[PDB]
PDB file of C-alpha atoms in Angstrom:
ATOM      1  CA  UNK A   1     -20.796 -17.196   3.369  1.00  0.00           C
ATOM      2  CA  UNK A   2     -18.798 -16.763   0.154  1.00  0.00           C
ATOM      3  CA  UNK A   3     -15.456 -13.776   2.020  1.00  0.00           C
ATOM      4  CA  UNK A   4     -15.461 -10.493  -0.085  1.00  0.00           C
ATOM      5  CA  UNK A   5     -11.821  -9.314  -1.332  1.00  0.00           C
ATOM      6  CA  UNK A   6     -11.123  -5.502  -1.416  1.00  0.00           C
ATOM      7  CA  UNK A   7      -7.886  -4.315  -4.235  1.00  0.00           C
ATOM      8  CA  UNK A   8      -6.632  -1.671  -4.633  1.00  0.00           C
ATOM      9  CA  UNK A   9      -4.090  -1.065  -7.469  1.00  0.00           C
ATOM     10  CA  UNK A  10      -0.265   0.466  -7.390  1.00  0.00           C
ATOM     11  CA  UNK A  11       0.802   4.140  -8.989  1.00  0.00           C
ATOM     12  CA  UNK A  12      -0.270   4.148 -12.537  1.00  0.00           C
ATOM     13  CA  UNK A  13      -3.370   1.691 -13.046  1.00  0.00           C
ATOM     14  CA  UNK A  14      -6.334   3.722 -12.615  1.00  0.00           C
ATOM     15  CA  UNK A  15      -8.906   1.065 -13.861  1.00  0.00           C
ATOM     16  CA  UNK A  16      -9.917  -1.030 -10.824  1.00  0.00           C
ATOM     17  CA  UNK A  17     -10.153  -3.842 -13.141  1.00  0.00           C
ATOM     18  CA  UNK A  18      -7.338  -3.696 -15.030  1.00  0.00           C
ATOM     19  CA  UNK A  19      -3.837  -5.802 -15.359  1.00  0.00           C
ATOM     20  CA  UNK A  20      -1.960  -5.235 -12.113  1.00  0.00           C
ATOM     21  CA  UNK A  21      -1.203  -7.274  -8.960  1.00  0.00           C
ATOM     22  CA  UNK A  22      -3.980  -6.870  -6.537  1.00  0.00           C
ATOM     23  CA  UNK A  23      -6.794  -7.579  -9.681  1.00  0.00           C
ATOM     24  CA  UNK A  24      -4.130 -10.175 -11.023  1.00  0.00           C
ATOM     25  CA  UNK A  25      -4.358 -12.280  -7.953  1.00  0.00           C
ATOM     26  CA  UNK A  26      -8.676 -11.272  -7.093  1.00  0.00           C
ATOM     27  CA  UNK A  27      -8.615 -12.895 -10.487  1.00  0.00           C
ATOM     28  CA  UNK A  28      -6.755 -16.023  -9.273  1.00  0.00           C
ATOM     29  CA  UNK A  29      -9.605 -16.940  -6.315  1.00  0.00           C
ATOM     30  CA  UNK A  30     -12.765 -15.462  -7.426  1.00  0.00           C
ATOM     31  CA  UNK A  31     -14.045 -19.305  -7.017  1.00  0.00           C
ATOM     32  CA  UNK A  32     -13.714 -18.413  -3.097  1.00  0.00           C
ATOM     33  CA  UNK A  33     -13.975 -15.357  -2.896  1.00  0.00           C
ATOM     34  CA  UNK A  34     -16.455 -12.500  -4.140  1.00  0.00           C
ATOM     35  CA  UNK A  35     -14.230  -9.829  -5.738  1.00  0.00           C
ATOM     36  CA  UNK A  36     -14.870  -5.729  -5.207  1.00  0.00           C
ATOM     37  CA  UNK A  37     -12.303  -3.584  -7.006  1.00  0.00           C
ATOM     38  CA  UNK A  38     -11.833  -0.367  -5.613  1.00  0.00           C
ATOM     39  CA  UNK A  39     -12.482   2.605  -7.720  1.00  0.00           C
ATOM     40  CA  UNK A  40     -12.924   6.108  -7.895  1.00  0.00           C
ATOM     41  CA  UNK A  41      -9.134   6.482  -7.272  1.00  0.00           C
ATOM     42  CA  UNK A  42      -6.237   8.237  -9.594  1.00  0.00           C
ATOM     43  CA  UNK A  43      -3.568   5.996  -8.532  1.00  0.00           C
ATOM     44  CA  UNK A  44      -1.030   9.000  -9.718  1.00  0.00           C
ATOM     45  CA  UNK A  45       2.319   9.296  -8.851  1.00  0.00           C
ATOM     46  CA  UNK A  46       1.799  12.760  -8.268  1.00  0.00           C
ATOM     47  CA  UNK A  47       0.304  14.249  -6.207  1.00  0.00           C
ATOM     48  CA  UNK A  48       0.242  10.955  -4.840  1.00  0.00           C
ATOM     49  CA  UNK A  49      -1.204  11.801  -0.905  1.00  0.00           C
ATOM     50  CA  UNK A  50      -4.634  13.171  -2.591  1.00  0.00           C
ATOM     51  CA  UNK A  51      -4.592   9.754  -4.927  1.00  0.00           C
ATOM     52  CA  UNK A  52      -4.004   8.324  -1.458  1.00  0.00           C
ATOM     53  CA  UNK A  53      -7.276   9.781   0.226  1.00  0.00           C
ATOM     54  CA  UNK A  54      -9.731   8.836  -2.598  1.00  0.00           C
ATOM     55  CA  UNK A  55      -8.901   5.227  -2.568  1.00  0.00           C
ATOM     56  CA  UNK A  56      -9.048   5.664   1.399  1.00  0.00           C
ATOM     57  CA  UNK A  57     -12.662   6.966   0.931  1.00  0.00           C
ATOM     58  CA  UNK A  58     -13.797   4.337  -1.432  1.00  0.00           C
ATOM     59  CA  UNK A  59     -12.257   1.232   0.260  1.00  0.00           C
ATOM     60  CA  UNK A  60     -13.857   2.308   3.665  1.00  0.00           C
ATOM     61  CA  UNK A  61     -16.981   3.072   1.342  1.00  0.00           C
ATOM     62  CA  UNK A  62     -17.152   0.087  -0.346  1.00  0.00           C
ATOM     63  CA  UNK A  63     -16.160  -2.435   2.750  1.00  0.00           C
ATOM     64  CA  UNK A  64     -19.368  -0.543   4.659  1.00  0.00           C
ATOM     65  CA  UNK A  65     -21.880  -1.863   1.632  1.00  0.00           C
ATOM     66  CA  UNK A  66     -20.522  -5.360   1.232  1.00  0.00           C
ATOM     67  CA  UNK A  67     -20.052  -5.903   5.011  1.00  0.00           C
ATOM     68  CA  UNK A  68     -23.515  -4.910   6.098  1.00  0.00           C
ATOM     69  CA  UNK A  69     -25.342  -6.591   2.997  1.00  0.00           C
ATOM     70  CA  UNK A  70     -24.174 -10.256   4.186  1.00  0.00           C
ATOM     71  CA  UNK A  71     -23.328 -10.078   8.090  1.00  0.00           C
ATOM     72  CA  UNK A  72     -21.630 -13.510   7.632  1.00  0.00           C
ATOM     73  CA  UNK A  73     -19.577 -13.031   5.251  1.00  0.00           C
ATOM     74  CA  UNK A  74     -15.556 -12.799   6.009  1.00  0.00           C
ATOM     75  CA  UNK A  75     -13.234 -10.175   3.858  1.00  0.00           C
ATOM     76  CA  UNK A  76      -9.636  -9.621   3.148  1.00  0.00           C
ATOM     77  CA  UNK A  77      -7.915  -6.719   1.652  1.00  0.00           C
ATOM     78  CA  UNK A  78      -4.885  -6.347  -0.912  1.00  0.00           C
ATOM     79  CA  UNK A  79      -2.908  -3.469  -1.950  1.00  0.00           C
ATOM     80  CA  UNK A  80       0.116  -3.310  -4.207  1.00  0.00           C
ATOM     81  CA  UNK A  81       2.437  -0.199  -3.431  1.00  0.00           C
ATOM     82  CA  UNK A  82       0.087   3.446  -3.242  1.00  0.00           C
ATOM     83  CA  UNK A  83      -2.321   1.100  -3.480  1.00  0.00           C
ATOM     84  CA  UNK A  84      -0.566  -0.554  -0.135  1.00  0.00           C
ATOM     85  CA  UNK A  85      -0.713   2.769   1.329  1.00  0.00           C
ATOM     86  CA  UNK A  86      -4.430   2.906   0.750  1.00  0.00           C
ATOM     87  CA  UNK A  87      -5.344  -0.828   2.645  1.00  0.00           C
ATOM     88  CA  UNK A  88      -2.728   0.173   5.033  1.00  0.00           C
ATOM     89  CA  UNK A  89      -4.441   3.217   6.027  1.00  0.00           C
ATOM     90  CA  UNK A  90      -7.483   1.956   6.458  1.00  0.00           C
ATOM     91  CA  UNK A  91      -6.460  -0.783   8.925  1.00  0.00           C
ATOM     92  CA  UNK A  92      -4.221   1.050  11.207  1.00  0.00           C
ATOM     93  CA  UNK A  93      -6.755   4.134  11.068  1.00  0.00           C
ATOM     94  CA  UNK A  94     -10.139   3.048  10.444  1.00  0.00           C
ATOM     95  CA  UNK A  95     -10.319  -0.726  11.408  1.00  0.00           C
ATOM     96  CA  UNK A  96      -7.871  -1.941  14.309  1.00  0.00           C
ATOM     97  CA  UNK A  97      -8.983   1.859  16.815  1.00  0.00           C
ATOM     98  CA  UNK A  98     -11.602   1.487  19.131  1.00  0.00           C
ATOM     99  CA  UNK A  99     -13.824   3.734  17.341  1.00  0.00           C
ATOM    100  CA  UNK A 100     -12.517   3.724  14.166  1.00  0.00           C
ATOM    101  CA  UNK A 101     -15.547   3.323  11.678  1.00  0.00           C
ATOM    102  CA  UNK A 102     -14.640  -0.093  10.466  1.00  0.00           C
ATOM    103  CA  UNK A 103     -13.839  -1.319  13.660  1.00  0.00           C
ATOM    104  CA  UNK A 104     -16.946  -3.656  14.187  1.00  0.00           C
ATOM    105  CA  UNK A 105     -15.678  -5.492  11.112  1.00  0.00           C
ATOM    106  CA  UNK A 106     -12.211  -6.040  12.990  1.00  0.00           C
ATOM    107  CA  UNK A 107     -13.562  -9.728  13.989  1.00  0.00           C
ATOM    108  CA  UNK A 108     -14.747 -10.500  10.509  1.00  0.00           C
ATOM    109  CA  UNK A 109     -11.121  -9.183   8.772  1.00  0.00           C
ATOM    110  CA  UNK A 110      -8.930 -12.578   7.683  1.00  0.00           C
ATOM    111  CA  UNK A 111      -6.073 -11.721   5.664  1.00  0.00           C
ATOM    112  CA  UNK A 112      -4.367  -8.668   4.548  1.00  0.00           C
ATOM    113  CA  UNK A 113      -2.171  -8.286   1.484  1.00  0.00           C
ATOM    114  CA  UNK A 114       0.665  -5.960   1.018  1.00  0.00           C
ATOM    115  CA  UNK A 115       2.963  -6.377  -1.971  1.00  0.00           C
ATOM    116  CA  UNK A 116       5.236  -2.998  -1.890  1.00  0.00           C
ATOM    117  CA  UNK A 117       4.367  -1.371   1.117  1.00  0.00           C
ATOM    118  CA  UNK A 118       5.851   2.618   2.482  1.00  0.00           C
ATOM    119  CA  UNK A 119       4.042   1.773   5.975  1.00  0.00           C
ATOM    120  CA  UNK A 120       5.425  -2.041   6.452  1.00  0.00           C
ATOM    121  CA  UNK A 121       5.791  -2.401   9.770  1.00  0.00           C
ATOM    122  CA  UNK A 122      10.013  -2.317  10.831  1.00  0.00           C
ATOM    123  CA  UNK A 123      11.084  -6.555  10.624  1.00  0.00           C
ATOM    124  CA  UNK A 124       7.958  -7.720   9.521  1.00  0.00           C
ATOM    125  CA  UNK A 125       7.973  -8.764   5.598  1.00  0.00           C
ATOM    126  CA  UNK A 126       7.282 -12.421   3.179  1.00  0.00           C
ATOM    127  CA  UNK A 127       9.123 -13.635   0.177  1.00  0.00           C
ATOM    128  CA  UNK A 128       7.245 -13.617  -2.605  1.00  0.00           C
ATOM    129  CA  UNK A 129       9.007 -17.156  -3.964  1.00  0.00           C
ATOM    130  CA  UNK A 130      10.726 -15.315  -7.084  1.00  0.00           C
ATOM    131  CA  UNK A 131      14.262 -13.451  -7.859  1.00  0.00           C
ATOM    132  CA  UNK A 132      14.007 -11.264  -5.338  1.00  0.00           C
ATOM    133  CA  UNK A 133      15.703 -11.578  -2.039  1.00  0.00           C
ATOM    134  CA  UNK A 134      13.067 -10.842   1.071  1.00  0.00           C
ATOM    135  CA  UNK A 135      13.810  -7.520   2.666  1.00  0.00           C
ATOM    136  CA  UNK A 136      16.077  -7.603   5.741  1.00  0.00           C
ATOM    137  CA  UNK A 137      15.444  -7.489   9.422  1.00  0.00           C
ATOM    138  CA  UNK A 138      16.497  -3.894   9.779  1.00  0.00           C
ATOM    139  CA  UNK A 139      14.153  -2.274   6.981  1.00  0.00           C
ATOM    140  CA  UNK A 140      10.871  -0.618   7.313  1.00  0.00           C
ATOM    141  CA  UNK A 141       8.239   1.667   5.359  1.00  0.00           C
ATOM    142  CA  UNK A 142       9.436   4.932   4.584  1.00  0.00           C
ATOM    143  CA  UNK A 143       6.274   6.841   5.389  1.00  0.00           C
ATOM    144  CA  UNK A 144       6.198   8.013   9.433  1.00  0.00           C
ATOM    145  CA  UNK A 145       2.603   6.581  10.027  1.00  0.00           C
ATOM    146  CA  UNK A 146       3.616   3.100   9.507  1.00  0.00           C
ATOM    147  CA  UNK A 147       2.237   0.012  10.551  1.00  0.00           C
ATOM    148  CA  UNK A 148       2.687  -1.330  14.259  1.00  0.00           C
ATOM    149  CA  UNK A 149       1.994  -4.548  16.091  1.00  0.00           C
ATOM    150  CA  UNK A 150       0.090  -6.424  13.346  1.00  0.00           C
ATOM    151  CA  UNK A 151       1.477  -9.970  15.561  1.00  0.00           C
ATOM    152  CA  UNK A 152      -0.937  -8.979  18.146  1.00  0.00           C
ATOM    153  CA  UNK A 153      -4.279  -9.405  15.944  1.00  0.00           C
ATOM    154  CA  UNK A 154      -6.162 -12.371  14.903  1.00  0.00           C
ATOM    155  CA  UNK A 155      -6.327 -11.533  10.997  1.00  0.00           C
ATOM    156  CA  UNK A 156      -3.608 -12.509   9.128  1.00  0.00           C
ATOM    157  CA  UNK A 157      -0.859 -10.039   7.181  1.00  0.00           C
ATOM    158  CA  UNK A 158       1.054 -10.825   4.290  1.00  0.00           C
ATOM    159  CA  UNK A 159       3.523  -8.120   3.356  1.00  0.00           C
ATOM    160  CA  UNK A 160       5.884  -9.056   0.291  1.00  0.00           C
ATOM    161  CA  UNK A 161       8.980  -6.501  -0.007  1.00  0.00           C
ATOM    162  CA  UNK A 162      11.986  -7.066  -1.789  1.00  0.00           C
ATOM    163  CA  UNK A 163      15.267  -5.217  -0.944  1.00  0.00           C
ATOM    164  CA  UNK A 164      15.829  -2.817  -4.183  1.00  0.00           C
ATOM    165  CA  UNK A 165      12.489  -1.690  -3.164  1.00  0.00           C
ATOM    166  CA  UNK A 166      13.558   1.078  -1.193  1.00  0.00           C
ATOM    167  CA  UNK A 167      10.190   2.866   0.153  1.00  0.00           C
ATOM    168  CA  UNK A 168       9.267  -0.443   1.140  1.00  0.00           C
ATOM    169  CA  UNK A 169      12.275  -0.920   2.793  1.00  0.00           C
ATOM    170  CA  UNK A 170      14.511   1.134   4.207  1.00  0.00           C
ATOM    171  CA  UNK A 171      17.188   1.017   6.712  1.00  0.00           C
ATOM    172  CA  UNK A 172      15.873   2.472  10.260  1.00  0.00           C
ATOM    173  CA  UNK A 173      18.753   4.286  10.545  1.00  0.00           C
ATOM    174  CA  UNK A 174      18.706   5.952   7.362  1.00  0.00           C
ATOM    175  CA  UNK A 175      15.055   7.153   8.231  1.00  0.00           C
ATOM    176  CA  UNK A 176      16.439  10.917   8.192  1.00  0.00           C
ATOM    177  CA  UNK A 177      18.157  11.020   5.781  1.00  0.00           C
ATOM    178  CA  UNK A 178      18.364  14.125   3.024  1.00  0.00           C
ATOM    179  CA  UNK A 179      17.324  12.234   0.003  1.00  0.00           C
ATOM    180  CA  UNK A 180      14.842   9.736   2.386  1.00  0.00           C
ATOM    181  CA  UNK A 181      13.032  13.187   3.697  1.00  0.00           C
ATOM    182  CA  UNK A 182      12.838  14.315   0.076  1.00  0.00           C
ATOM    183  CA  UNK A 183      11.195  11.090  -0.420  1.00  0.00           C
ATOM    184  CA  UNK A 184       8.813  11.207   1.761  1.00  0.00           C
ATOM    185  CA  UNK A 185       7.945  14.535   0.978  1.00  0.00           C
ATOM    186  CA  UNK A 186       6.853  13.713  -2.278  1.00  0.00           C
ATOM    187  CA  UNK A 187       4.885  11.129  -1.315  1.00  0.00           C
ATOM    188  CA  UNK A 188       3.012  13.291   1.486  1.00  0.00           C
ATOM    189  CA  UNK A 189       2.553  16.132  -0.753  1.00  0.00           C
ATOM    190  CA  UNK A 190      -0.752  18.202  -1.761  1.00  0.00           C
ATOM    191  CA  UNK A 191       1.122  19.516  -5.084  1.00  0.00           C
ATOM    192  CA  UNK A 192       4.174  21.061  -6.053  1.00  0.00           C
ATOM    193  CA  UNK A 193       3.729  24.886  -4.823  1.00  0.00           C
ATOM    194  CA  UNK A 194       0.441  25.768  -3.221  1.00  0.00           C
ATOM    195  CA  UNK A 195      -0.594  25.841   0.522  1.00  0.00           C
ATOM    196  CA  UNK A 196       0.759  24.071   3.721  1.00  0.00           C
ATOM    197  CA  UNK A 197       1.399  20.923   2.677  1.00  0.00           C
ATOM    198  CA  UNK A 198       2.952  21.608  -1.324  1.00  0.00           C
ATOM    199  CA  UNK A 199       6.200  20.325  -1.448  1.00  0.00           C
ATOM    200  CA  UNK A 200       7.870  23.798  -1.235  1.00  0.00           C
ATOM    201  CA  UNK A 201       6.207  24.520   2.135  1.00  0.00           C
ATOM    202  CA  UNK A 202       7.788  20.893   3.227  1.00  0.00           C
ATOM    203  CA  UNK A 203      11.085  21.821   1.873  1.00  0.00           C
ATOM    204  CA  UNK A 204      11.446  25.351   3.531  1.00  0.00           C
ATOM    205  CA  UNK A 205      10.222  23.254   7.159  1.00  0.00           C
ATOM    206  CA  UNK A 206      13.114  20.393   6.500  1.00  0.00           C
ATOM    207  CA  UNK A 207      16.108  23.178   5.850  1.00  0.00           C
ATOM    208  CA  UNK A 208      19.257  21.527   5.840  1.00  0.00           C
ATOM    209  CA  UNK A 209      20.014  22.516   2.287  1.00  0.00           C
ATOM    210  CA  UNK A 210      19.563  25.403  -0.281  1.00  0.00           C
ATOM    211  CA  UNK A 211      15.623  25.314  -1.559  1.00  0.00           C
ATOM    212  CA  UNK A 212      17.329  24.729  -5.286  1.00  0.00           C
ATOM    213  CA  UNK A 213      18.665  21.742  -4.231  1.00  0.00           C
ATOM    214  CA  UNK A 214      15.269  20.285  -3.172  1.00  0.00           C
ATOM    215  CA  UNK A 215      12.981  21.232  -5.623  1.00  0.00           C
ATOM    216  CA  UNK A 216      15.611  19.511  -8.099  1.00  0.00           C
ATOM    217  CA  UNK A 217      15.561  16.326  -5.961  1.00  0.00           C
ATOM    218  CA  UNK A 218      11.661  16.397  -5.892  1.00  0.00           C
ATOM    219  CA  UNK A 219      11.669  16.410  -9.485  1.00  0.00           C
ATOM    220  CA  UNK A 220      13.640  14.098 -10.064  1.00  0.00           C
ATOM    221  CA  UNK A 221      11.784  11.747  -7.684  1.00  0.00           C
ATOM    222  CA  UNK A 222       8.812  12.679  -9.178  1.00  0.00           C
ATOM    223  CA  UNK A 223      10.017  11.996 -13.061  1.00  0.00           C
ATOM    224  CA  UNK A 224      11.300   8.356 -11.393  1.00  0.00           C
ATOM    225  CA  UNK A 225       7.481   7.879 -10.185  1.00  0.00           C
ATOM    226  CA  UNK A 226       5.987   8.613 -12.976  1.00  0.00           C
ATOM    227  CA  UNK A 227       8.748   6.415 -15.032  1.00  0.00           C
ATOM    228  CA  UNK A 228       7.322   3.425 -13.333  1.00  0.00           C
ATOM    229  CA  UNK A 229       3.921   4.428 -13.132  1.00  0.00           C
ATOM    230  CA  UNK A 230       3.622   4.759 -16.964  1.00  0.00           C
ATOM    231  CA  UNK A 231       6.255   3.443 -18.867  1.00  0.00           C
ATOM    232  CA  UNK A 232       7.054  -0.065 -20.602  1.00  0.00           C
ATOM    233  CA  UNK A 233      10.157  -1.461 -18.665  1.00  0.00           C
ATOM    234  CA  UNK A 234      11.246  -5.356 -18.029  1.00  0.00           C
ATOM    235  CA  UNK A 235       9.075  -7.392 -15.846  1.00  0.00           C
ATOM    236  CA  UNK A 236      12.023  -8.218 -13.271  1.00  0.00           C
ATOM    237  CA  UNK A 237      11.954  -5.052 -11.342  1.00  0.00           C
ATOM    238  CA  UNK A 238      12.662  -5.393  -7.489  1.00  0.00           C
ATOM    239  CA  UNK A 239       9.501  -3.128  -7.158  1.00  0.00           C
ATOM    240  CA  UNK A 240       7.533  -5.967  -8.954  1.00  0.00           C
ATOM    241  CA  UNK A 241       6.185  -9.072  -7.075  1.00  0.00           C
ATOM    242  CA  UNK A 242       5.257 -12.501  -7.844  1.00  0.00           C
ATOM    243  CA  UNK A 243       1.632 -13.077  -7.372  1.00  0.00           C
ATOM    244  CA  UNK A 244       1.369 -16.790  -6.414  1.00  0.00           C
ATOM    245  CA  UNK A 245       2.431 -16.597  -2.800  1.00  0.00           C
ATOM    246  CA  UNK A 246      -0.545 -14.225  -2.239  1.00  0.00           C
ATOM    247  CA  UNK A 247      -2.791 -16.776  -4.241  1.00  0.00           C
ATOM    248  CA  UNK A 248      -1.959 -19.782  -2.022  1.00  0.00           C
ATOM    249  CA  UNK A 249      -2.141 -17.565   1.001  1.00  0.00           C
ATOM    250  CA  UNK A 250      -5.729 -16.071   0.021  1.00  0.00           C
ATOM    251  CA  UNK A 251      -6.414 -19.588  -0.838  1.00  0.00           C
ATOM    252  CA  UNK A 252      -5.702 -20.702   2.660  1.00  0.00           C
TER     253      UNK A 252
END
């Protein structure tokens, strides 16, 4: 029967049906495909990790209802950067494990979309057909819990990353880095100062340098984040993607 399509949108567009990638291309194939925005999810920049979890709750949430409602009906999934993280999450954690909760749906899953993605798997990435050069062979996800041996499945993965779009791809061996753990850090973080996981804690576990020194680097990640996330810049970004790619590859 008619596939459903599960989006989830980057840092800064909390409306599930707003302007964005992911709802940008939905828009672009509802004639094939029934369209489910995912909701009940900040997208903030920061904390981003607790953004992270709500959008991990609702696409598992919603994917349950549409999935067991018509039995015959395919799905795909597309995320655009936290948003990435999100559909990212929920395939390596809840759909490809042998008893993850989604993981009778694993035969029914088609196509996965990743535009901007901090657990692309190390090599594997798309050009997105635009002024952007593809990310290069050596470059992964920032985050740790990445994305592994997506080859070896039936569904199939589109992950667009331009170089310039550093979370989405950095250099393996710059995956320790000062400024790259910082980074990360943010991006993992429960808040600012509070319990074990506020980026303080994190930053007295890494060491390396004075505390000072990280808590200014944190902020001025964080005011970089949100200067993305909600602010009126050109439309030629390496973090930004051309959409049509994705179109003609949800399109079949």
């Amino acid at each position: 029967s008619k596939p459903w399509l599960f989006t989830v949108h980057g840092t800064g567009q909390p409306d599930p049906l707003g302007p964005g990638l992911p709802a940008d291309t939905a828009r672009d194939v509802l004639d094939i495909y029934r369209w489910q925005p995912i909701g009940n999810y900040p997208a903030a920049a920061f904390p981003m990790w607790p953004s992270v979890e709500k959008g991990v709750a609702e696409l598992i949430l919603q994917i349950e209802l549409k999935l067991d409602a018509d039995p015959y009906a395919d799905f795909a999934m597309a995320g655009y950067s936290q948003g990435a993280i999100v559909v990212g999450q929920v395939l390596k954690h809840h759909i490809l494990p042998p008893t993850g909760r989604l993981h009778r749906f694993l035969h029914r899953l088609k196509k996965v979309i990743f535009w901007g993605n901090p657990m692309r798997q190390k090599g594997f990435a798309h050009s997105d057909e635009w002024i952007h050069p593809v990310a290069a062979p050596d470059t992964l996800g920032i985050l740790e819990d990445r994305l592994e041996n997506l080859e070896q499945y039936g569904f199939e993965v589109r992950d667009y990353a331009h170089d310039g779009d550093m979370y989405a791809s950095i250099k393996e061996d710059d995956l320790h880095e000062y400024e790259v753990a910082i980074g990360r850090i943010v991006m993992k973080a429960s808040g600012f100062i509070g319990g074990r996981d506020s980026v303080v804690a994190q930053l007295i576990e890494l060491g390396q340098r004075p505390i000072t020194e990280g808590i200014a680097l944190a902020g001025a990640i964080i005011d970089a984040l949100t200067f993305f996330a909600r602010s009126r810049m050109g439309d030629k970004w390496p973090h930004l993607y051309n959409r049509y790619p994705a179109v003609e590859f949800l399109r079949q």
